[PDB]
Amino acid sequence: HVFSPQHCGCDRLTSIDDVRQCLTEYIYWSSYAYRNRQCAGQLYSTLLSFRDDAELVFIDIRELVKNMPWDDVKDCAEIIRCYIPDEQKTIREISAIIGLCAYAATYWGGEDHPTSNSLNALFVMLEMLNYVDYNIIFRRMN
Amino acid sequence: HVFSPQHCGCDRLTSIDDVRQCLTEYIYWSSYAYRNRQCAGQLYSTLLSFRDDAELVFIDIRELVKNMPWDDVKDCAEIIRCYIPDEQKTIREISAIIGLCAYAATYWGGEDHPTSNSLNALFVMLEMLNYVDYNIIFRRMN
Structure with a gap:
């Protein structure tokens, strides 16, 4: 028995209202639930491919995740805004x-439980994204 | 191997910067981790007593948790603002x-895995509380 995201099996999202719950549960699921429960949907296929958009923007995300202050959400957001400064973000920057x-959440997670740091990855994203951003990234989720 | 909140054993908080991280992990821990990790600190004793402040403000919180739309964070916040309307909240209202x-999180949680609803309880609180609220409730956590 392991956390099962509502949209785990989904190939698409219907409403734009599902966008925040979806991203949230995705990032939580990346903590540890991923190695016990898989998600074959086309939706989770797309999400996982956002690692490519991350590498494109942050260059080396492995070395970046290690460095960043995951104990401090506010400061993490400040660091991100070095790479993505504007409040108006592009679909690539949002991805x-x-x-x-999601990578940070997997890196910092335990095997069967989440950690303070892996949870904080979830809140860093929330800090970063506004409602206008959710409309845009919605276009990659159908 | 269960989630262990950073302040589980703590009897107090030191910095006001720990306040958001603490409440967050408390609410997550109320999902299911509470049955496998005991938190004897005076801090968690105080937090759990906030159930009393809840009953005082929402009358019957059991019947209220069942009714509320936990699938919809925005709407839950709207419902709460019926009871606590002002942006300037009192220390009792914040508690x-x-x-x-926390009660909602326990009600909606599973036995070994959180649920979409139990997580949403966490986000409802985040929706409700601003930084000025964290300074106030900090006075109950030392």
């Missing part, structure tokens, strides 16, 4: 942010 | 909100 946070 | 969300 990068989700991509980075 | 009520934490109290209610």
Whole structure:
């Protein structure tokens, strides 16, 4: 028995209202639930590919995740805004942010439980994204 | 191997910067981790007593948790703002909100895995509380 995201099996999202819950549960699921429960949907295929958009924006995300202050959400957001400064973000920048946070969540997670740091990855993303960003990234999720 | 909140054993908080991280992990821990990790600190004793402040403000929190739309964070916040309308909240109202969300998280959680609803309880609280609220409730956590 392991956390099962609502959209785990989904190939697409219907409403744009599902966008925040979806990204949230994705990042939480990347903590540890991923190695016990898989998600074959086309939706989770797309999400995982955001790692590519992350690498494109942050260059080396492995070395970046290790460095960043995951104990401090506010400061992490400040660091991200070095790479993505504007409040108006592009669809690639938004994917990068989700991509980075999901990687951080996997890096910092335990095998069967989450950690303070892996949870904080979830809140860094929330800090970063506004409602206008959710409309845009929605276009990659159908 | 269960989630272990950073402040699980703590009797107090040192910095006001720990306040958001603490409440967050408390609410997550109320999902299911509470049955496998005991938190004897005076801090968690105080937090759990916020159920009293919840009952005081929302009358019957059991019947209220069942009714509310936990699938919809925005709407849950709207419902709460019926009871606590002002942006300037009192220390009792802030405790009520934490109290209610922790109860909701326990109600909706599974036995070994959180649920979409139990997680949403966490986000309802985040929706409700601003930084000025964290300074106030900090006075109950030392």
